[PDB]
Amino acid sequence: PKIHYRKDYKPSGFIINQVTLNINIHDQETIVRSVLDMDISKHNVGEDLVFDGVGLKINEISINNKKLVEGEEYTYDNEFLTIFSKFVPKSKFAFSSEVIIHPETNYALTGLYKSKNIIVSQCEATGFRRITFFIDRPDMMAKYDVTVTADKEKYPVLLSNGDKVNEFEIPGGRHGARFNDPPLKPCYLFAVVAGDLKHLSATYITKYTKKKVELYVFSEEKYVSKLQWALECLKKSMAFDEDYFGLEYDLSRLNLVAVSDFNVGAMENKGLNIFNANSLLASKKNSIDFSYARILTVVGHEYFHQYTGNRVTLRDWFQLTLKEGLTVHRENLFSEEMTKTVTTRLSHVDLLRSVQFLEDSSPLSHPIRPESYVSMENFYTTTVYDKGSEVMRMYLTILGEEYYKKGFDIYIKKNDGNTATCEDFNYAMEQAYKMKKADNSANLNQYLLWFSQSGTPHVSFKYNYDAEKKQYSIHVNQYTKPDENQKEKKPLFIPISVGLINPENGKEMISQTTLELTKESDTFVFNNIAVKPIPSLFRGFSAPVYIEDQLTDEERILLLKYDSDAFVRYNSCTNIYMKQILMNYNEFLKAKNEKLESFQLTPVNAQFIDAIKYLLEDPHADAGFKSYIVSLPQDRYIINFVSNLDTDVLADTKEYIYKQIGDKLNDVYYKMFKSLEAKADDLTYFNDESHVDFDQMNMRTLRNTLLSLLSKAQYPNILNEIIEHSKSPYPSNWLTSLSVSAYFDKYFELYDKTYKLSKDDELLLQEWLKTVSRSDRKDIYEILKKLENEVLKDSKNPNDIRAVYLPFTNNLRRFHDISGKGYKLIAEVITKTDKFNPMVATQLCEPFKLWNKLDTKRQELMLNEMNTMLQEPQISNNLKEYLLRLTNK
Ligand SMILES: [Mg+2]
Ligand SMILES: [Mg+2]
Ligand SMILES: [Zn+2]
């Protein structure tokens, strides 16, 4: 397998100026005719002309209308088309080809494929080469003129990039549409859609130029009514980019299209955004609450790419984080502003610290700009996206809003063209940094280490207070563990947003302060500090790091109750939980190892439990925040802090801790569950498709969290509440009723009831599948077999496969069953899936990412399954590369 190296970037010896496509869709095949108007670039050294072209069936190829002969003038090996240099012209020339492809049986969902009754493309990163021959790399900028023809009755709606400039009838019940898109673009932003699509539409009038923009949202006829929220989110997204960034949409039309079969959430093709239906379609009746934030987020994200990805392009794929980290950051800013809840930021931090931290301490650890790849598809990671976004967000923390907006505008103005690298963004931000610091000797050269250095920094603290001097010191240390990417780790530029809380009255003692840690260690001193403060460290989670606060649980409880910053409160709670988890874990483990007949456990801190009760009973406190405080930290967060983690021992630890807190607070939980009902479940706006209330949805989250806690505890008569909850109009409620009934003899009754409720909506059935999959059932293996035989079957829909299998892998007790049956089951699914969809097969490997962090026996069981998967004769390049890196081979 070819390994591509970052330091090897060289511009192409060729230029593609113009692409002219004719895509002719027929019943059994699609015919693709392409004329490339080409040139020789200044970097040309007389090399062969090599095009990317994967799985293409050649009918003919030509240079300047002269047919080329196979073997003599060219070879094709189903991956590269090589035209020998002596046959390549020395000035401007036309390359043309006609190939046959088969979207009907393209189950990998890359290139041109059929999703149900829709023909659709997916070209990022390297899928255009699956449609026709090309120098398939993002620095090859070209103009596109695309004609699509198809059966009119089957495919009445035809879409590509640019303006529809002609529509025509074709004999035999066919029709065509031509689309010209004069602005230059990379081929991964080419898109085509053909289907019987229904739409909603609106007009948006831009803020400054007052250009009218046509907004169209598309789906199959059955689900067209589920498009309204997406339309509202698009409007919101356009307004936000205008209001915050001063950026207007430049085209006269934007199309959003939902498809049922999609590898990821969506795709930002210019003017023609294509979406996983689960990230575009929603209704109050047929969607869970989560669909609303998911649509807002994904619609926002793809919209924001129009500048950060599309108008400013990548030079090469190693720069992925420059578009992805920057757009996730813009997306997160958008969502925070639209939702107006502190839980939006908390949820992003919750994702990074569980999922991405796991990745960064695993054998798959890479920097946000990697030095190499084999498979581009394996490159779209939580590190590149979510740590990338935290790195992009630190610019704004360091600069503040005014100067960040200056450096951003500098970046857009200097690179609106035009390809760019991560250094181009850093340069732009550095100019703002020079302006902010008021000296042109200031630089951000050390900041670049955030792009190149893998691993999570550990930031630890020590404190000194001198009562007579009124002088407070914070001593800070940073440390990143060596890994396979760097022997030596260097100190990073770490911004630490801090407050100092007066423990006597809970007040702020100092103004907003961001400590700039640029060394391995530093001491920050504060004068005129009247009383010994409690430090509020890394406000808003100001750097993507392990925080070691070295605070007592009493100090943490006081931050939890009194601090102004949502993250530090949440983190203080998290830290209290972690200390307890680690203590009880070691006590259980010692008992297990020593085969003790009797032993002790350290109870949960009583004042902590008292602080939880205080916050839950505070009517002015946020319901979403409340649901975090009653929940223990994620398993994938916990595992970063324990060597050779025994999953049964951890399951016993969590169980003990939840019972300790429930024994004190269950009456409080029950009272709140009941008192929240009216507002949480309010039906006033149920039939208003555009009325979305994130606070109310957080109240439902809280109620559903509490119901779960009460059902686990077998709170007296709680089954009555569960049964009533199943009668709710909200899917979040009635699907919660299913999962919490797991502990009761009424489970299969609610199984059948909720199935009947879900079965006639494709997306809702997938949510039902997730709920069953995640159900805390002792017969969960028999249940999964039932799902396979009765619901899933041989579906190749990634949403169906992911819904059945992934949530079950979060079942700590059962997925990690000591026989290895859970590991075996997932491995069988990966191998089966890899035959038709390597990308999704790789996604299904996520459970194994923590393999080497578990107890010796479980390490061995997982490793065996991965080596077995590796031994499969037909294994894809994508899966093979991933497992080889994961198993350190
Ligand atoms: Mg083929
Ligand atoms: Mg994407
Ligand atoms: Zn993106």
Side-chain angles (χ1 to χ4, degrees), residues 1-6 8-9 11-26 28-32 34-56 58-71 73-103 105-152 154-213 215-284 286-376 378-401 403-412 414-444 446-467 469 471-483 485-486 489-503 505-553 555-619 621-711 713-744 746-773 775-777 779-781 783-784 786-793 795-823 825-834 836-845 847-852 854-870 872-877 879 881-888:
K2 198 199 189 285
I3 311 160
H4 297 92
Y5 291 100
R6 185 179 67 91
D8 284 349
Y9 174 84
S12 176
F14 302 98
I15 307 271
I16 299 156
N17 287 140
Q18 175 86 51
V19 184
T20 306
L21 286 175
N22 283 262
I23 303 158
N24 309 120
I25 301 156
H26 295 269
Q28 281 179 296
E29 51 180 28
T30 285
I31 302 163
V32 183
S34 185
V35 180
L36 299 186
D37 290 309
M38 291 190 62
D39 207 346
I40 306 309
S41 82
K42 63 176 166 177
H43 304 108
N44 187 275
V45 293
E47 70 266 39
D48 294 344
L49 176 45
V50 183
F51 294 102
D52 301 295
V54 175
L56 308 180
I58 297 170
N59 277 348
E60 50 184 275
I61 69 167
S62 299
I63 283 170
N64 300 323
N65 290 331
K66 182 194 159 64
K67 210 164 183 299
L68 297 192
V69 303
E70 199 285 312
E73 303 171 315
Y74 81 85
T75 60
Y76 179 57
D77 65 3
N78 210 46
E79 189 176 10
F80 303 106
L81 167 65
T82 302
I83 301 154
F84 307 123
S85 65
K86 63 188 276 181
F87 305 111
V88 180
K90 298 190 186 182
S91 61
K92 286 193 165 95
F93 64 100
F95 173 80
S96 64
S97 73
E98 175 184 284
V99 301
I100 304 176
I101 58 175
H102 303 87
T105 62
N106 189 3
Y107 311 123
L109 317 185
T110 183
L112 196 62
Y113 68 97
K114 196 175 202 267
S115 175
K116 209 180 294 193
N117 300 309
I118 299 161
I119 302 296
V120 60
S121 60
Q122 173 55 43
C123 295
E124 194 188 12
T126 63
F128 191 75
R129 68 187 66 178
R130 291 175 179 257
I131 303 178
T132 190
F133 295 106
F134 210 74
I135 304 177
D136 187 356
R137 39 185 278 176
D139 60 344
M140 303 301 290
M141 305 281 288
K143 304 157 60 156
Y144 288 69
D145 182 322
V146 182
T147 304
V148 194
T149 76
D151 181 76
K152 194 175 157 62
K154 281 189 190 70
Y155 307 106
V157 175
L158 309 167
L159 301 161
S160 193
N161 322 87
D163 310 300
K164 192 158 68 174
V165 299
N166 195 36
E167 291 172 295
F168 54 95
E169 301 294 290
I170 304 164
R174 299 176 64 74
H175 76 140
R178 181 184 189 181
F179 296 81
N180 199 25
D181 191 18
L184 296 173
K185 68 167 172 292
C187 62
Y188 81 87
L189 294 175
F190 165 88
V192 59
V193 183
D196 187 9
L197 299 168
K198 306 293 162 176
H199 65 269
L200 311 175
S201 62
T203 306
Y204 190 90
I205 307 166
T206 69
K207 192 171 192 178
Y208 305 100
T209 60
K210 300 207 148 192
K211 167 198 259 280
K212 271 191 170 74
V213 183
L215 306 186
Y216 285 77
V217 296
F218 296 89
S219 75
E220 72 179 281
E221 182 182 335
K222 186 178 168 180
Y223 299 122
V224 70
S225 63
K226 295 176 71 176
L227 285 163
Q228 193 53 51
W229 177 233
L231 197 45
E232 306 299 341
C233 293
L234 183 56
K235 293 185 214 173
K236 284 171 158 79
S237 189
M238 299 176 79
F240 185 77
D241 231 1
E242 286 178 338
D243 298 344
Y244 192 98
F245 289 104
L247 302 175
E248 294 187 321
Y249 193 63
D250 51 321
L251 312 176
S252 41
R253 182 151 161 180
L254 218 185
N255 302 297
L256 281 54
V257 183
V259 298
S260 294
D261 304 84
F262 209 78
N263 288 331
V264 296
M267 181 61 214
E268 77 274 16
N269 331 101
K270 297 171 77 171
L272 184 54
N273 295 353
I274 294 156
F275 291 81
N276 194 321
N278 79 18
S279 301
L280 201 69
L281 309 175
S283 65
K284 266 89 179 277
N286 286 337
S287 309
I288 57 161
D289 289 350
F290 179 84
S291 294
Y292 284 84
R294 175 67 183 175
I295 292 162
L296 176 73
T297 270
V298 174
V299 172
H301 182 103
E302 306 315 333
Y303 179 73
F304 301 137
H305 266 314
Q306 213 51 261
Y307 272 89
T308 52
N310 301 356
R311 282 176 67 152
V312 180
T313 300
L314 307 183
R315 186 190 73 172
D316 60 67
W317 290 119
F318 299 99
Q319 316 306 324
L320 192 56
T321 199
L322 173 75
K323 74 192 256 282
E324 299 307 340
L326 191 47
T327 304
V328 173
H329 168 59
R330 280 148 56 64
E331 169 207 335
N332 296 162
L333 277 173
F334 171 60
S335 289
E336 291 181 44
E337 182 66 34
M338 293 303 100
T339 62
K340 291 299 202 167
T341 323
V342 297
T343 63
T344 304
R345 174 64 183 157
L346 298 184
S347 71
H348 306 154
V349 175
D350 210 80
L351 187 174
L352 188 87
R353 301 206 297 179
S354 51
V355 181
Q356 197 277 330
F357 277 16
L358 190 171
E359 182 167 89
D360 231 345
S361 59
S362 83
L364 295 167
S365 175
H366 54 284
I368 63 159
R369 182 165 67 178
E371 299 312 315
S372 58
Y373 63 81
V374 163
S375 175
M376 254 320 287
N378 294 348
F379 218 74
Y380 291 71
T381 59
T382 183
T383 295
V384 170
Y385 274 63
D386 304 308
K387 174 173 176 171
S389 177
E390 295 302 297
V391 167
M392 286 302 175
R393 185 190 182 274
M394 279 186 289
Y395 287 121
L396 166 62
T397 303
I398 293 158
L399 293 168
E401 196 177 282
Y403 283 106
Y404 176 77
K405 289 181 177 175
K406 288 191 169 191
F408 186 93
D409 213 50
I410 291 183
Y411 169 75
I412 293 299
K414 192 163 189 158
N415 302 282
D416 197 27
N418 256 143
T419 60
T421 64
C422 293
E423 283 93 351
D424 296 318
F425 196 82
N426 202 59
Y427 178 86
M429 290 294 136
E430 181 177 281
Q431 303 312 118
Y433 192 61
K434 285 179 190 304
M435 292 173 197
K436 191 207 164 71
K437 291 289 179 178
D439 70 302
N440 279 28
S441 71
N443 71 70
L444 293 177
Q446 185 190 18
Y447 203 89
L448 281 172
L449 293 168
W450 280 116
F451 294 92
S452 61
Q453 187 166 292
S454 66
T456 310
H458 297 71
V459 186
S460 53
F461 292 92
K462 273 161 178 176
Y463 317 102
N464 189 61
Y465 183 69
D466 198 287
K469 284 180 183 75
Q471 192 178 76
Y472 185 69
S473 307
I474 308 172
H475 326 284
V476 195
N477 192 74
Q478 69 165 293
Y479 168 70
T480 300
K481 274 168 198 178
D483 57 24
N485 302 305
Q486 284 96 24
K489 299 285 174 189
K490 300 189 192 207
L492 303 168
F493 187 147
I494 301 181
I496 312 167
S497 306
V498 297
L500 296 176
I501 292 303
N502 184 333
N505 66 13
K507 290 262 209 296
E508 304 288 328
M509 302 184 67
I510 62 178
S511 285
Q512 178 188 256
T513 302
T514 302
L515 308 182
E516 292 177 355
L517 177 70
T518 63
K519 293 193 284 197
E520 172 182 313
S521 70
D522 214 340
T523 298
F524 302 89
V525 187
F526 300 86
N527 287 329
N528 303 306
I529 305 300
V531 75
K532 189 191 169 180
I534 302 177
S536 177
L537 301 157
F538 284 107
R539 286 182 165 181
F541 191 60
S542 67
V545 300
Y546 290 103
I547 305 157
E548 295 154 16
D549 69 20
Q550 318 275 16
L551 296 177
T552 67
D553 281 347
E555 290 173 323
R556 288 162 173 163
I557 287 152
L558 205 147
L559 288 173
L560 176 52
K561 285 160 60 90
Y562 301 121
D563 197 355
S564 54
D565 189 71
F567 166 74
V568 173
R569 293 175 81 200
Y570 153 97
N571 200 42
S572 292
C573 185
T574 301
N575 293 340
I576 293 159
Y577 275 131
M578 283 307 306
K579 185 178 177 260
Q580 188 70 28
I581 291 163
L582 291 189
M583 179 66 75
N584 290 147
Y585 179 90
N586 285 314
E587 289 163 343
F588 275 121
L589 182 71
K590 198 167 196 273
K592 181 187 179 145
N593 285 345
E594 291 173 21
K595 289 185 183 66
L596 295 187
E597 287 306 331
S598 187
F599 65 98
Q600 279 145 263
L601 294 166
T602 308
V604 176
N605 179 303
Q607 289 75 50
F608 177 54
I609 294 170
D610 275 345
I612 297 163
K613 182 176 182 275
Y614 173 87
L615 297 188
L616 295 177
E617 289 182 343
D618 182 11
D622 188 81
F625 178 77
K626 287 173 194 205
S627 62
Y628 282 112
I629 71 158
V630 299
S631 312
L632 271 60
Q634 296 283 324
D635 293 342
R636 291 176 294 190
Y637 178 79
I638 296 161
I639 195 150
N640 290 299
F641 305 92
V642 181
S643 302
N644 305 308
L645 184 125
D646 183 319
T647 53
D648 299 311
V649 178
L650 177 60
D652 289 349
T653 299
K654 296 162 59 184
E655 178 186 73
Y656 172 69
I657 292 159
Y658 275 122
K659 184 84 200 296
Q660 283 273 305
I661 301 174
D663 284 351
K664 303 237 194 115
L665 303 188
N666 278 341
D667 286 342
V668 180
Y669 296 166
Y670 181 75
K671 184 185 200 205
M672 283 172 71
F673 172 82
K674 299 298 286 179
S675 66
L676 285 151
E677 179 170 351
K679 283 176 182 172
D681 289 355
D682 177 29
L683 293 172
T684 299
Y685 299 104
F686 193 82
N687 289 126
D688 191 317
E689 293 163 343
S690 299
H691 183 97
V692 181
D693 183 338
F694 287 99
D695 292 324
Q696 178 181 12
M697 292 188 300
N698 276 340
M699 291 172 194
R700 288 208 284 273
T701 292
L702 180 59
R703 285 193 87 228
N704 288 322
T705 301
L706 301 180
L707 186 59
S708 183
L709 291 172
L710 296 164
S711 303
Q714 305 280 281
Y715 193 75
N717 307 123
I718 197 72
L719 182 57
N720 296 151
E721 265 83 24
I722 299 175
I723 295 311
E724 282 312 300
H725 210 55
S726 77
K727 296 165 192 184
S728 183
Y730 291 109
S732 289
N733 295 336
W734 58 256
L735 282 173
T736 292
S737 82
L738 177 59
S739 53
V740 306
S741 76
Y743 308 107
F744 298 94
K746 285 217 175 293
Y747 179 76
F748 281 121
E749 166 177 321
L750 293 184
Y751 179 103
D752 296 335
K753 173 194 173 85
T754 59
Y755 171 77
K756 288 193 218 273
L757 290 177
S758 316
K759 67 163 164 52
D760 305 304
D761 181 297
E762 173 185 284
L763 294 183
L764 187 56
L765 187 49
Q766 291 160 1
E767 299 304 331
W768 179 82
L769 288 169
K770 297 188 180 174
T771 308
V772 174
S773 182
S775 279
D776 191 13
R777 291 293 296 184
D779 56 345
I780 192 60
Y781 284 93
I783 288 160
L784 294 176
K786 195 201 208 306
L787 288 186
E788 285 165 2
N789 299 338
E790 295 177 3
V791 188
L792 180 59
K793 310 182 189 292
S795 180
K796 294 178 211 292
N797 182 328
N799 288 0
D800 286 344
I801 303 169
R802 288 184 293 238
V804 174
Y805 294 111
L806 287 179
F808 160 72
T809 68
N810 299 131
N811 193 316
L812 192 59
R813 273 193 200 289
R814 302 275 146 67
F815 170 67
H816 296 279
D817 187 286
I818 196 63
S819 65
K821 71 197 275 186
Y823 309 151
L825 175 69
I826 304 305
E828 286 168 4
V829 179
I830 295 155
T831 293
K832 187 189 179 299
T833 305
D834 194 51
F836 63 84
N837 197 323
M839 271 174 269
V840 172
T842 301
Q843 290 169 5
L844 296 161
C845 288
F848 294 99
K849 291 173 89 183
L850 51 54
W851 75 271
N852 64 337
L854 299 176
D855 60 86
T856 289
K857 187 63 219 275
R858 281 176 180 97
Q859 287 189 46
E860 180 183 307
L861 294 166
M862 279 195 164
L863 185 49
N864 171 70
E865 295 302 336
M866 288 186 285
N867 287 334
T868 298
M869 284 190 295
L870 274 171
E872 287 291 332
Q874 304 310 300
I875 192 167
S876 68
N877 292 331
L879 187 59
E881 170 220 17
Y882 193 82
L883 291 176
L884 284 175
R885 291 188 286 120
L886 185 50
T887 61
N888 266 325

